[PDB]
Each structure stands twice: as structure tokens, then as C-alpha cells.
């Protein structure tokens, strides 16, 4: 998981899956939005945050062998830590889940 707090615009950085990550979550109009950085270099910008579908859409981003992040529901900064969670999945688990998605 990702320890999160109820703030309209926040950022998180941690070491996950033998690599360094930096997630910046901000409110944009209605939907939540995130910006993902790995090891100091950007990956993707302004990813719309939704339930279930992963934040990284593209193969050359989420893994040759790395992982991914998934929300269980549509995010809401007034609910974080309270019934809404973000989970990080390693390569094998996310490959299994992606195959199950079909």
C-alpha cells in the first residue's frame, strides 16, 4: 500500500521494488490527477485517477520487469486513509491481474 493523507494536493516518495518512486497527487477540477517519477526521471504526466485501472498504461513504462499502482475506487482527497486505498503490485502479481482483467 501507500500511506496517504487527506490533503487536496500532496506528494509521496519511497523505495518500491528495488527502485525509487515519487508520486505527486493533486486535485484537478473534478477528477484526481497524478504525476509519476521513477529514479529522478519522469514517466508520465497528468494521469487521470480511476478505480481498478492502473496508473501506467504503456508497456515501456510500467515494466520490462517493474510494477504498477492501482486504486480500488475513484479517489477523493477527503477520504484518503479512510476506506480508500492505493496499492503497489510487483511484476508477477500485476501480470496475473492484467491477464485476469480480460
Amino acid at each position: 500500500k501507500i500511506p496517504l493523507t487527506a490533503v487536496p494536493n500532496q506528494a509521496i516518495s519511497f523505495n518500491a521494488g528495488s527502485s525509487y518512486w515519487k508520486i505527486r497527487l493533486y486535485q484537478n477540477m473534478d477528477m484526481m490527477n497524478a504525476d509519476i517519477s521513477r529514479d529522478g526521471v519522469i514517466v508520465c504526466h497528468g494521469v487521470r485517477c480511476f478505480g481498478g485501472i492502473p496508473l501506467l498504461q504503456y508497456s515501456h513504462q510500467y515494466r520490462p520487469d517493474y510494477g504498477n499502482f492501482v486504486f480500488d475506487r475513484d479517489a477523493d482527497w477527503t477520504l484518503f486513509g479512510d476506506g480508500i486505498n492505493l496499492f503497489y503490485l510487483d511484476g508477477a502479481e500485476f501480470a496475473e491481474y492484467q491477464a485476469l482483467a480480460t
Binding site: 484537478n28 477540477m29 477528477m31 490527477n33 497528468g46 487521470r48 480511476f50 478505480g51 481498478g52 485501472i53 498504461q57 482483467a101 480480460t102
Partner: protein, 260 residues
């Protein structure tokens, strides 16, 4: 101004990818199939109102039935001395709400008016209720793509295995005018199917499942006068078509029972 224009631009950075929602996604999903709107009220007709004499029931009254669903009326009408008139109803919430056929109860009451009653001659206009908002739409696209990923033999196997009380399926294709596994050279390029079952109590459903997968240039005729028993000689009588179509024909066989 600057912040607003930047944010409005960033809202729709990626739209063609079907992770999107709220309206553009409606057309992104309408390319294949997708139904929306679907938020109506259960309008009625042929009401039953037993009351006094020469009075009028005020519009937008309140109606309630046994598990407490709230219903409003539509038209105001006068009462004949007999004690019977017909009214028009509408629901509180824009949902396909169910009126239990039990005599209603009164919330808002006018004078000398009582006993909102049911009648068989009334029409029950069942509405759609926001059945696909944004996420079950995505799951609908996913299910469609899953159905479409399978090929002829695989699709037949999945469709026939889907029906209840089936146990096994065997599928073979001749692929030539010669013999590969069994002596089916009746026609040059058939597609043979055998199905096991706990009885086939629904013979039409099996034909429909087989027909839902069809190749459009490959006949289903199989048989060598010695292989598994065919269900019928000339035709297996499928349904005509669910969608603007007419009768087609499909044929399939069953194995021979053996006692060990």
C-alpha cells in the same frame, strides 16, 4: 485566466484511450455498442380512485405502497357520483421502482378521498434506471473484447460450454478434402461438433449457442453414415434471429453411449 486555461487543457489530454469518462467516453464506447440515458419514471395509466362526490383530486399528491415507495400523481380529475375514476402516476426517484400489487396508502390526503386501489387493466411502464453510468460500461467493453478474442473452434467451445447441463465438447475441422481424424469427407470443408449433456432439455438453446458462432462461408454439414448420430436429417431448426433476421439452419451430432 491562465490557471483556468491550463487546467481545462490538462483535463482532456488523453481522450481516445477508453479510461476516460463523462460524455466523450459515451462516443468512444458507441463505436461498437453502448446504451446510455436510461433514467425514466414508471408512468402509469388506468388508476382507481374511490372517493366522495363532485370533488377533484389535486395534482402532485403523494402516494405510498406497502414497502414505502413514494409516488406522485400527474393529472387532476373530477369525481363522478358513482365513486370511481382513473388517475396517472409517476415515481419520486428516476429509477425502475417496483409497485407491489397491493392496495396503496395515503400520505397527502384531500377531503373525502381514500383507498388508492390497484386494477389489472392498468399499464405498467417499466423504466431503465441509469443502468450503465461509467464503469460497468468499461466492463461491457472488456466483456465484448473477451468474446471477440476467441476464434471459431474456441468460440464454439465456450458458447456450448456456457449453456447449463452441458459436460463436454469435441470440435474438429477437416481443413482438406482428406481424412485427418475421422472419415468425414461428405463435404470438402465442414466443421464437425459433438456435445455431451445431461439430457438436452433445451434443444433450441443448444442450437442458438451453436448459431451465435458462425463463419459465413463454412457449412456445418457433417456425417459419414457411420459417425455419431445426427439430431435431425435436414435441419436442426435454430431460432430465426434475435436482431432483424430470419430463419437459418445449423446441424450437430451426439456421441454413442458405451457401457464399461
Amino acid at each position: 485566466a491562465r490557471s483556468s486555461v491550463m487546467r481545462n487543457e490538462a483535463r482532456i489530454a488523453n481522450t481516445i484511450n477508453p479510461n476516460v469518462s463523462f460524455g466523450t467516453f459515451l462516443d468512444a464506447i458507441c463505436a461498437l455498442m453502448g446504451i446510455e440515458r436510461g433514467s425514466d419514471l414508471s408512468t402509469f395509466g388506468y388508476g382507481v380512485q374511490v372517493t366522495g362526490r363532485s370533488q377533484t383530486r389535486i395534482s402532485t399528491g403523494s402516494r405510498v405502497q406497502t414497502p414505502a415507495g413514494a409516488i406522485f400523481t400527474v393529472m387532476s380529475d373530477v369525481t363522478i357520483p358513482a365513486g370511481g375514476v382513473a388517475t396517472i402516476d409517476i415515481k419520486s426517484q428516476e429509477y425502475g421502482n417496483i409497485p407491489l400489487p397491493v392496495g396503496n396508502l395515503i400520505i397527502i390526503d384531500g377531503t373525502i378521498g381514500w383507498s388508492g386501489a390497484k386494477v389489472i387493466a392498468s399499464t405498467r411502464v417499466d423504466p431503465g434506471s441509469r443502468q450503465m453510468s461509467d464503469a460497468e460500461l468499461k466492463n461491457a467493453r472488456v466483456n465484448r473484447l473477451a468474446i471477440q478474442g476467441r476464434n471459431s473452434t474456441m468460440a464454439i467451445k465456450a458458447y456450448v460450454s456456457a449453456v447449463p447441463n452441458v459436460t463436454s465438447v469435441n470440435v474438429i475441422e477437416n481443413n482438406t478434402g482428406a481424412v485427418q481424424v475421422v472419415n468425414g469427407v461428405s463435404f470438402t470443408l465442414p466443421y464437425a461438433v459433438w456435445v455431451c449433456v445431461a439430457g438436452n432439455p433445451d434443444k433450441q438453446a443448444v442450437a442458438d449457442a451453436l448459431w451465435a458462432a458462425h463463419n459465413g462461408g463454412t457449412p456445418w454439414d457433417y456425417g459419414a453414415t457411420n459417425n455419431g448420430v445426427p439430431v435431425d436429417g435436414p435441419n436442426g431448426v435454430p431460432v430465426r434471429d434475435p436482431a432483424s433476421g430470419r430463419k437459418y439452419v445449423v446441424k450437430w451430432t451426439t456421441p454413442i453411449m458405451y457401457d464399461g
